[PDB]
Amino acid sequence: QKAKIQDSLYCAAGAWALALAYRRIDDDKGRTHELEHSAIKCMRGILYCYMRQADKVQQFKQDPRPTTCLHSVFNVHTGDELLSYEEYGHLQINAVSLYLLYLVEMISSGLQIIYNTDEVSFIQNLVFCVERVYRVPDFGVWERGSKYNNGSTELHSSSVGLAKAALEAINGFNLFGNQGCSWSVIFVDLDAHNRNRQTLCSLLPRESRSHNTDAALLPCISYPAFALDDEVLFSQTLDKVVRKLKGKYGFKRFLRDGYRTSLEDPNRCYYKPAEIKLFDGIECEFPIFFLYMMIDGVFRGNPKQVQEYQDLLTPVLHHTTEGYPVVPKYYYVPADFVEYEKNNPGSQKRFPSNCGRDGKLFLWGQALYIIAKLLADELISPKDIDPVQRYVPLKDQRNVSMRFSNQGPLENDLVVHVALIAESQRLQVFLNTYGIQTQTPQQVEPIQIWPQQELVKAYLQLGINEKLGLSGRPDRPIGCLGTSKIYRILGKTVVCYPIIFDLSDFYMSQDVFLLIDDIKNALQFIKQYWKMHGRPLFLVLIREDNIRGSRFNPILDMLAALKKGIIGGVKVHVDRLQTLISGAVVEQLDFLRISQPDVNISEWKDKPTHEILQKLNDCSCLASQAILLGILLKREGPNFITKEGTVSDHIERVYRRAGSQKLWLAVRYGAAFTQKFSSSIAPHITTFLVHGKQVTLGAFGHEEEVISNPLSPRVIQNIIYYKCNTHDEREAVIQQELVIHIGWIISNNPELFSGMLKIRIGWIIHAMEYELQIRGGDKPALDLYQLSPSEVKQLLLDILQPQQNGRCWLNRRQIDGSLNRTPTGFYDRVWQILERTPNGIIVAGKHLPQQPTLSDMTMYEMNFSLLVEDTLGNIDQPQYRQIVVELLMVVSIVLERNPE
Amino acid sequence: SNSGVRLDGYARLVQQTILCHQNPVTGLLPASYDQKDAWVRDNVYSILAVWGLGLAYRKNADRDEDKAKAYELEQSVVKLMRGLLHCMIRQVDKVESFKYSQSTKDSLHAKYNTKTCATVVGDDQWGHLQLDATSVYLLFLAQMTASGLHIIHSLDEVNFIQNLVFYIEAAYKTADFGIWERGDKTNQGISELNASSVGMAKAALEALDELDLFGVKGGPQSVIHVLADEVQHCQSILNSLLPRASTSKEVDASLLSVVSFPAFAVEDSQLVELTKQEIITKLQGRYGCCRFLRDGYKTPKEDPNRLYYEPAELKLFENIECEWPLFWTYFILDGVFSGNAEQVQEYKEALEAVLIKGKNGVPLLPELYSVPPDRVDEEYQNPHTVDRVPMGKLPHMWGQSLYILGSLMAEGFLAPGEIDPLNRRFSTVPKPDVVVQVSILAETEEIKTILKDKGIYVETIAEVYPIRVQPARILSHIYSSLGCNNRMKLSGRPYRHMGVLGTSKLYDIRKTIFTFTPQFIDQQQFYLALDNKMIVEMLRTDLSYLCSRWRMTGQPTITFPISHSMLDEDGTSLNSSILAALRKMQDGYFGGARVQTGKLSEFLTTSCCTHLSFMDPGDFKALVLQLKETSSLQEQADILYMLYTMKGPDWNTELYNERSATVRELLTELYGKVGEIRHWGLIRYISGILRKKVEALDEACTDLLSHQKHLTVGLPPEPREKTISAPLPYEALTQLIDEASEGDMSISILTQEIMVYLAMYMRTQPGLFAEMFRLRIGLIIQVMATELAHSLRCSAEEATEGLMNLSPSAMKNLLHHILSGKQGQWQRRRRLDGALNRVPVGFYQKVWKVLQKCHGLSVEGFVLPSSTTREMTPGEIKFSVHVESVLNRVPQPEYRQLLVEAILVLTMLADIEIHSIGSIIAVEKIVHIANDLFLQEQKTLGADDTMLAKDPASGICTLLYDSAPSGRFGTMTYLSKAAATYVQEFLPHSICAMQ
């Protein structure tokens, strides 16, 4: 009474392919009709089963978790759940993506599956829920996930690739088929697709951190997906998989896979530690991958591979009583050759499984076999089986949509349009007196300029259904690429500017160097990741408060460089906005119509409330005012009433006044008071995690929290705010500025952070504090709370430098140890030492026994490196740690150079 | 344009009315109100407006938006149809169980659920018998398939539909609760037959004759195969019971649907006009019409929180039936369909006045208008005068959808030829006649020589090698394999007999031509085919019946081979009847049809051919010695019966040392020598031993029941007497007959024979059964035995032996003579009339009329209270059976006739006087007084004592029985004088007679 989703979908696809082949006869006698009807019935049944569970989709749209996950296994007789989620996980997103891809393929073929408009809303919500698959770990294709099989979820590259392929396929497509006006289209976000592409590219060489390679990487770089458009890396991955997973009787799942082997017993769902070491050498063989390889061969037009795999598959194939072909699931070895096979791999013979003689079959395998045979027999063409043109050859990758640019694959010379809009008439005439041409917003009356929040609200209004209960698209900020387009709302053209220009409560937005750098970075981002037809539109606004007297020259410099035409190797164009708007494609949203201080903490802590109020009233210094407001908030509360309204309103007013006056310490104190956080920490932590590094949040010399998996913003915010309440006052904003700067630097200069694994903000803070103190010398060390954002960035870039001679080597060792830098090849050297160390290595009182690490981990597994780092992290003096690392390297080199 | 605006308005109306509660995924709307249920009939009926709107949009679309709208509408109705089909296909077990035998427990549920399509109630909390819903669903499915909307996807659904066809094919003899889910007229529901169910089922059966579910792109196996005999039986049943919906309801307004837009199944348009006029005259009100007389739904009485209506419906539910505008909204569609316009405007104007305007100002149809609880007495004196108020739920999707469809059709956007693509509106066109083809074959060379002697040219069974002939039981066994599936646990069509309509057509089995002989020439079932005149008359009847309807295409074909039993005693010539029948077949006039003879070669080029595709490949030893040595059929039959009862139901007698001869074996081979002597003295006896059962008994029983008659099996007295008042299954009927027959054995065969004769004679001459209400077989057989004993002047045993020996044709002749009605002369007539209790045609009405003016009529202590006059009606059967039970207390038929005559004369005399007796009238006293007066008059005349004798056990002179009714000396005058004397005895010294 159990059913999967993959096998039924594959059988339906095979039936559809057979019907497509049979369509070519005008006297088919209704053979094609039965197959189309069976495929349509299967699709309708799966859609009904998916839509039966509605609360789970809404729950997953807000707080994804295994508890709120959509069920993937249910009873076949009534389409109802049968087994509890505590024994199967039910977390799998590959099935949904593959179902969406097959559904859109069938609709493009000419079949009809969607009945009414509620299905469109359900598909939209499914797309919305699947858009965020690049963060939540999955259980994997094999449902086991980790090789250890302990009950942990990890990221899988195949799921990301399938999701990206479905996202490309579903974009801009009519779901009703031949006819459709405005109620059969699906809207997509470019930011999610970009993030999925980045994650896939970063995690493409290795399928997972715990799996060096797997056979599941095949249906994602092959006919079902066709997502690897890199040629050289695809060939390298194919060669690696073929070399490392080839077998006499088929392709194994992966190395050290004890899946239904002879030694396996049906009494322990989770494998015990060190059992994987014993489970090697008896891995099963799955001949189904031969069909996939043959399909790839015929698709790529390589007959020799097809012939070789057909000859290989001929003997292993079985026959029924009538001689019908049979594809057994797996191959197993008898118990009398457990040890002999280990000495000689593949010299012995295996035995067929139960589903290879009679009474048991493999529907998925038979469907793949018949599809492969039909493709080989030339009864159809690759175009017929791929009506969407998923796979294109090298000579046609010239003017496709969402994949390659019009300039060619190995070319990047995109020209981006830039529009100049003034803010005030006085500023406009002041700019014109210097030759600068800007236009006031009052002279573009036909055109309207709206902020980013309006588009977010309009998107939120979309996707609402009353019959089931739908919340629509979640309220999320829109990226630069989304805002680069032009929209039409209620017959009125809508244009928006990037979120960098809007007023921000933070302080680094008042530094013009930061603005120069971030607009340059945005321009580079637009240049690199723009593939839509038509030139992108960029809007820039200049405010009168920006110049502020002496700070008016470099703005002239940047604007003159912009007028010149080239900005750091990036070509730009400037003209009147109305001219650019005319003759350009405008996006349409048609859904709406249808729907020093003189006050110390200790001294003034015990003062009465009235005295503090009087002191606040009659004082003009900003620091004393801020500290008095903080004391009042801590003692009385945020609801207290003062001379200038409520406590919160007074805090906001003084914070804004400090920001206007730009005195950095008071702005940071007020920002800490307001408990405001940036809306970009999650992308930084997720790219740090996907890179392979680790981040720990805390204060130097105090408790620290380690993060190993992506977490919701609420939990991270609560943890960091509790820590901030525990130890210090302004470390929140300093940590935020450090993390944003580090993320930006690693995004633009990834090679700079090479050699460091655990990134700790507090130790880096201590590092630049020490460096600044050393630079000060006789002069007292400057406080870091009063440093400008440009100075902070310069200091961070200076300490991050690879360092040279001249300065004391003790300081260099201190900086290197604080950064937790490790030499290249240190992990492998440690592993080879441990292999040739019969007893073990003991440091700082920690023990590393050789037997468990040799019987559990492998050469390149990351958890061995994590254990080594944990063992080495007990060293208190960073210089001592660096010296120990150098000694270990010397020992490794000396021992390797002489084996005697 | 105006058409676009009207279409947009209608689309908005239907979207705001019906489509707002579609319940996606499941596709089934709630059955109105806060009931949280889905009735099949309402779900089927609420889709016609949407289908019509989509059809109208499709033809005038010519645009992307209209294409999308029509696509959405068609896809939504397809989704609803699939959702409805899922619930039925989820219950294959109930269908399989119901396919064998008929019971209430093994029937599909009538109210399915919402999401998850589960069950809500058990099998003992609702009436789960509604054939009309399934019939109308199948009819609309066929109509939609003909329209071009795909509803069927998988081939297993074809098998399920084929099984459902057999599930609903037996509606002409199956009793159901009814459309109103209330059983018969009163509560405590008892299954009964109604014309609505069979009328709905006949059109559904006719629609799926050859319609493929795969459209134009189907294959060999895509068409549902149906028979033709069931359609004719349903048509005959409907014609017999057209004026009245059932045996308990005088008239029902639900008959409109049968004789209007849905499921046109009717003929003889005069009947249509008569029933329409009757409905208009009887049920029309002020703001609508009532379903039927004496219904208490939504009344200020009846204690609505209580069910199972107590038998106290005297006047508490009279003239207060509330209303039902559904019959009003049916009339506009009925008029606008064929040719009527002024009736359409009149009905529309009448209906617009009863409408209620709700939210957004849109038409809304209320369910019913209830009488005020205070003004009830006035309505009893002035019916249809008091205003009413709305009551109950009024989101009526059925009536609203019907009204919307009617308005859309009347607007002219849609034509009547689009709603029905099958052209079902031309059922009133007469068919002129049909020519029948008959083929004659010889069994061997001797038969061919004999026929060629007299000038008849035929061909033997050989020489036609490409053509083969076998009996029809092989055809039935072959047909018992259609629509069989092993995975879904389907056993295919159950075994059943084949009529003449199925064997007439040619058949194709694996590129070969097959022909099947008619069933009535079968000798291994019964002995009815052993008589030549019997064969002739059944052949004539079958010829007339085949020539009558023949609603198929092509000329029919009948094969009538001559067997060895058709020759004379010498075996050298055919019988006179046979040669006369063949000569009458020649010259093109036999019976009541045109007959053309020839050879099968010429008939091949012009004849209906049927292609079958499912058949394609994918000390007892001393007694035994005495039996062997003894002779004579009597002794052999006696010893065989004794051994069968004692030890040999299946034991081997070991009579032959080489072959194991079973008792059944020897009994069967006894038939061979029994048939040659034509000794009708033990063939019935051995048939009783073999327990042979006559085929088609159940249809004969249901035909006899449909004529408002009560059947009876067994000899008197009760409780042994039974009463079959409802149709019963074949096995149940057989066991009931066996229990009534007891151990006499031959009584069962005689009763079956008499039932067959009565069923055969009822159709031809349905006028000889008048003046009779209850048929008792045992009394009939006793009458025949007594008549034969009188005719032969022999003992009772000799009369019974002679009756047993009588030929079946002689038995038919005697039965016809008895039924026709054609000292010792008047006494015999009185005895016969009393035995057959042939009461006059208006006895019950006169009894009720006299009862209205007295306290009752007591007979020998038993009294019949006059309070019964208000509890019942003269047309009701219960009153009639009550009077019959009161009358038959006396055992003497002469006393019964005297009682009847005295009651009739009392009823006549009561008219002259205008007064109320107010006392109990004893009729035995009247008879005794009249007899005493006659005795005194005869003594005064001077007659001797011998003439004025006395009866042994009744006290009435036999000469009084001998006396003629009328004349100056008849019994009528004496009875009138005695009645007048008795009336004067209990009168206030004044008569005041005047007329």
Side-chain angles (χ1 to χ4, degrees), chain B residues 319-430:
Chain B
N319 307 67
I320 45 170
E321 308 106 350
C322 309
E323 252 160 359
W324 274 96
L326 180 62
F327 324 121
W328 268 26
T329 206
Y330 259 118
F331 260 111
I332 174 175
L333 264 163
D334 187 16
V336 78
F337 225 63
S338 58
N340 225 310
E342 70 281 3
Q343 140 185 31
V344 176
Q345 332 294 300
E346 146 189 351
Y347 276 122
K348 174 163 33 193
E349 288 217 280
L351 192 77
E352 294 330 289
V354 314
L355 213 68
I356 294 158
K357 187 163 273 273
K359 300 294 111 184
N360 318 114
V362 286
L364 275 164
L365 165 153
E367 171 163 44
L368 48 94
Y369 310 82
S370 195
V371 75
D374 55 62
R375 192 152 298 96
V376 61
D377 303 327
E378 183 173 342
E379 193 76 356
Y380 273 81
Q381 319 305 296
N382 315 308
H384 316 297
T385 55
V386 174
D387 275 25
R388 304 141 181 270
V389 317
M391 161 85 78
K393 93 192 184 48
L394 80 167
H396 221 291
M397 301 204 210
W398 187 8
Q400 187 123 46
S401 170
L402 271 168
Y403 150 75
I404 287 158
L405 176 56
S407 155
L408 212 167
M409 184 94 87
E411 280 292 333
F413 295 112
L414 257 167
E418 296 256 48
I419 303 306
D420 77 84
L422 305 192
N423 314 80
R424 284 201 64 75
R425 46 210 159 91
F426 305 125
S427 66
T428 78
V429 190

Side-chain angles (χ1 to χ4, degrees), chain A residues 151-195 197-325:
Chain A
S152 184
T153 58
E154 37 180 9
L155 264 63
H156 288 65
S157 196
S158 59
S159 301
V160 188
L162 272 163
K164 180 173 85 85
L167 266 281
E168 310 164 329
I170 217 64
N171 158 277
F173 172 71
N174 197 295
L175 212 64
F176 269 33
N178 264 326
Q179 74 287 20
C181 308
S182 283
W183 27 96
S184 318
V185 301
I186 317 293
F187 302 122
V188 199
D189 262 23
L190 277 90
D191 298 292
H193 193 223
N194 156 82
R195 281 191 304 275
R197 153 170 301 105
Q198 313 274 50
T199 310
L200 170 141
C201 290
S202 155
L203 254 171
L204 183 64
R206 301 169 42 75
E207 173 273 329
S208 87
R209 78 160 69 262
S210 63
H211 264 70
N212 186 22
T213 180
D214 199 306
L217 219 35
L218 244 192
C220 143
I221 68 184
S222 65
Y223 154 70
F226 274 137
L228 261 184
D229 52 319
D230 204 76
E231 323 160 298
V232 304
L233 191 156
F234 162 82
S235 47
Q236 160 267 358
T237 326
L238 211 53
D239 304 355
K240 156 168 203 180
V241 174
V242 164
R243 289 208 288 94
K244 187 83 140 173
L245 263 305
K246 185 142 188 167
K248 155 75 151 143
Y249 280 117
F251 272 12
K252 308 154 277 285
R253 267 153 41 104
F254 54 94
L255 287 167
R256 251 179 194 189
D257 177 34
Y259 191 92
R260 207 69 71 101
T261 196
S262 199
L263 301 183
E264 192 257 340
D265 319 314
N267 36 54
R268 289 186 71 262
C269 72
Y270 301 137
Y271 280 5
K272 231 146 190 201
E275 298 272 41
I276 313 110
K277 164 203 81 53
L278 178 59
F279 270 123
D280 52 20
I282 43 176
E283 307 131 19
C284 297
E285 304 260 32
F286 301 82
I288 186 172
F289 302 107
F290 283 140
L291 306 161
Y292 278 110
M293 256 303 180
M294 163 156 20
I295 289 155
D296 284 48
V298 47
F299 254 109
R300 297 289 279 232
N302 190 296
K304 336 282 182 313
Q305 183 171 40
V306 173
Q307 312 168 312
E308 82 165 280
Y309 280 120
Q310 175 55 80
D311 306 3
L312 283 152
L313 182 61
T314 279
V316 66
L317 216 65
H318 266 255
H319 291 344
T320 64
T321 51
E322 322 166 79
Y324 281 33

Side-chain angles (χ1 to χ4, degrees), chain A residues 872-888:
Chain A
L872 206 76
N874 227 44
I875 294 149
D876 301 330
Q877 294 275 41
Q879 46 262 50
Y880 203 101
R881 153 166 198 286
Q882 212 276 345
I883 285 292
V884 164
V885 165
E886 174 147 44
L887 166 59
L888 284 163

Side-chain angles (χ1 to χ4, degrees), chain A residues 37 41 44 114-115 179, chain B residues 64 71 75 79 116 153 157:
Chain A
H37 270 309
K41 194 163 161 183
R44 282 303 294 179
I114 291 305
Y115 284 145
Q179 74 287 20
Chain B
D64 40 326
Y71 175 72
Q75 249 187 347
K79 169 205 277 293
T116 69
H153 298 349
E157 295 151 19

Side-chain angles (χ1 to χ4, degrees), chain A residues 375-396 398-425 427-429 431-572:
Chain A
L375 262 167
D377 281 303
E378 214 157 351
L379 279 157
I380 41 173
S381 79
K383 313 274 180 233
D384 298 281
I385 193 53
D386 213 8
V388 152
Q389 330 179 11
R390 277 292 305 178
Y391 165 82
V392 309
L394 175 168
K395 284 222 300 164
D396 321 60
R398 274 198 167 159
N399 206 321
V400 77
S401 90
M402 264 48 39
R403 294 188 114 172
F404 333 103
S405 309
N406 84 89
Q407 298 277 44
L410 323 157
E411 288 285 31
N412 233 353
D413 212 273
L414 211 164
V415 171
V416 46
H417 287 156
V418 155
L420 319 177
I421 304 292
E423 197 207 42
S424 92
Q425 155 73 59
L427 185 63
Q428 178 263 0
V429 63
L431 289 163
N432 214 307
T433 39
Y434 260 54
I436 290 133
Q437 173 44 280
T438 52
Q439 57 204 301
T440 186
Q442 277 58 79
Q443 283 295 325
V444 289
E445 186 224 67
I447 278 284
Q448 301 179 331
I449 298 184
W450 314 16
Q452 150 267 345
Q453 180 260 119
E454 312 295 271
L455 264 282
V456 177
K457 202 64 72 202
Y459 278 11
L460 173 77
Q461 225 290 321
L462 184 147
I464 178 151
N465 170 239
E466 302 280 6
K467 196 54 73 63
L468 301 154
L470 252 51
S471 70
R473 189 201 178 274
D475 202 305
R476 154 171 41 171
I478 291 304
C480 182
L481 299 149
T483 55
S484 201
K485 310 190 222 169
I486 46 184
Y487 306 93
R488 187 102 69 76
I489 292 281
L490 271 304
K492 303 282 148 288
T493 37
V494 178
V495 201
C496 315
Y497 45 84
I499 39 184
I500 67 192
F501 289 113
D502 53 47
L503 207 151
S504 80
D505 50 86
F506 305 119
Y507 52 92
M508 81 305 288
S509 55
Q510 280 79 351
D511 197 340
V512 79
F513 309 126
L514 260 292
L515 267 76
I516 290 154
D517 297 16
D518 80 359
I519 65 140
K520 222 157 279 200
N521 154 275
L523 246 180
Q524 191 58 21
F525 195 114
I526 288 282
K527 175 96 177 299
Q528 218 295 332
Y529 286 77
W530 188 246
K531 307 290 186 195
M532 311 295 327
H533 202 176
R535 280 90 86 75
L537 185 135
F538 218 132
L539 201 75
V540 57
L541 291 153
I542 302 100
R543 191 166 64 261
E544 194 266 354
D545 320 287
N546 295 359
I547 47 180
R548 195 48 48 201
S550 73
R551 170 54 23 178
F552 149 84
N553 250 329
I555 315 175
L556 300 158
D557 294 34
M558 30 196 310
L559 184 166
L562 170 57
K563 179 256 189 185
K564 181 58 60 157
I566 305 94
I567 295 297
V570 195
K571 292 186 172 170
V572 287

Side-chain angles (χ1 to χ4, degrees), chain B residues 19-32 34-247:
Chain B
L19 277 166
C20 270
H21 330 273
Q22 154 84 250
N23 189 242
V25 155
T26 314
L28 318 170
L29 313 95
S32 164
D34 321 304
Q35 287 209 40
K36 328 160 301 312
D37 276 320
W39 263 262
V40 180
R41 191 172 43 257
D42 307 65
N43 283 248
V44 173
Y45 267 118
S46 305
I47 219 71
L48 316 187
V50 176
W51 181 37
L53 184 56
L55 268 167
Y57 255 95
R58 189 77 228 169
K59 103 192 170 187
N60 224 327
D62 60 71
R63 282 299 204 199
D64 40 326
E65 313 153 60
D66 297 342
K67 275 158 157 285
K69 293 195 199 73
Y71 175 72
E72 189 177 347
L73 298 150
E74 301 155 18
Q75 249 187 347
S76 311
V77 53
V78 163
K79 169 205 277 293
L80 188 138
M81 273 304 150
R82 288 211 73 76
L84 213 67
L85 173 60
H86 278 160
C87 317
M88 268 143 42
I89 203 149
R90 268 201 203 198
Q91 286 221 90
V92 297
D93 180 19
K94 247 70 202 305
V95 172
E96 178 79 354
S97 268
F98 200 92
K99 254 160 82 185
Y100 305 129
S101 100
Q102 326 285 309
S103 324
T104 42
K105 308 169 65 52
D106 313 351
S107 53
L108 298 171
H109 291 204
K111 43 192 288 183
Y112 288 109
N113 202 345
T114 50
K115 204 103 171 193
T116 69
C117 306
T119 37
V120 286
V121 317
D123 310 5
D124 55 82
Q125 305 293 343
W126 206 267
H128 294 320
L129 254 298
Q130 289 178 51
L131 303 162
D132 62 297
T134 304
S135 314
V136 69
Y137 162 79
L138 289 164
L139 162 66
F140 275 123
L141 165 61
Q143 291 265 40
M144 275 162 195
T145 280
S147 174
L149 311 167
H150 52 270
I151 299 159
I152 294 279
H153 298 349
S154 97
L155 277 166
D156 281 17
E157 295 151 19
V158 179
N159 296 350
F160 187 63
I161 292 282
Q162 192 77 65
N163 272 257
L164 271 163
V165 161
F166 314 136
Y167 173 85
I168 65 149
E169 99 182 333
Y172 70 98
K173 64 189 175 131
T174 296
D176 51 8
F177 276 96
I179 182 163
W180 307 125
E181 296 141 276
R182 213 79 87 89
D184 61 76
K185 181 187 266 287
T186 179
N187 256 4
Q188 317 163 40
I190 328 185
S191 59
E192 92 291 356
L193 192 137
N194 43 307
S196 92
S197 90
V198 293
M200 203 46 97
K202 154 164 184 293
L205 277 164
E206 184 160 2
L208 296 150
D209 212 328
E210 289 284 73
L211 187 77
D212 48 355
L213 316 181
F214 267 43
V216 64
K217 306 142 281 173
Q221 54 264 72
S222 271
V223 282
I224 328 308
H225 293 313
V226 309
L227 313 183
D229 303 278
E230 320 297 338
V231 183
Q232 308 315 311
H233 290 315
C234 291
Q235 172 152 307
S236 299
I237 287 281
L238 204 69
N239 280 344
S240 196
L241 216 68
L242 204 31
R244 326 215 318 162
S246 77
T247 184

Side-chain angles (χ1 to χ4, degrees), chain B residues 606-646:
Chain B
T606 311
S607 184
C608 215
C609 61
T610 279
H611 192 338
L612 300 183
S613 311
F614 58 90
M615 261 295 104
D616 277 18
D619 184 22
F620 287 79
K621 310 209 177 229
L623 292 150
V624 165
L625 194 72
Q626 273 185 326
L627 198 160
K628 180 161 186 158
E629 65 200 79
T630 202
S631 175
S632 322
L633 195 68
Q634 309 298 315
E635 286 94 287
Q636 297 239 34
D638 212 37
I639 184 54
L640 280 154
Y641 177 56
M642 191 93 203
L643 199 161
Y644 174 83
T645 63
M646 272 328 98

